[PDB]
């Protein structure tokens, strides 16, 4: 279920352009992910 | 995209879809699968 540390180091680049055009709890979400790292 | 790590972040990236800016849950969906 949950997205490990690895995985999230991963998608960063992916993640990226949809994450900062997006909005929600989810979109902050995953830019804590990657950001904090 | 991959084996496992497009089933593993796609579920999590559909919920962010919902509500993105411009058309970007189109993108979304058409990398990732349900």
Do not use: N, Q
Request: aromatic share 6%; charged share 30%.
């Amino acid at each position: 279920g949950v997205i490990p540390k690895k995985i999230w180091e991963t998608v960063c680049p992916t993640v990226e352009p949809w994450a900062k055009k997006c909005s929600g709890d989810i979109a902050t979400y995953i830019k804590r992910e990657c950001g904090k790292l | 995209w991959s084996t496992i790590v497009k089933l593993t972040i796609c579920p999590t990236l559909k919920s962010m879809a919902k509500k993105c800016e411009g058309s970007i849950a189109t993108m979304i969906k058409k990398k990732c699968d349900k």
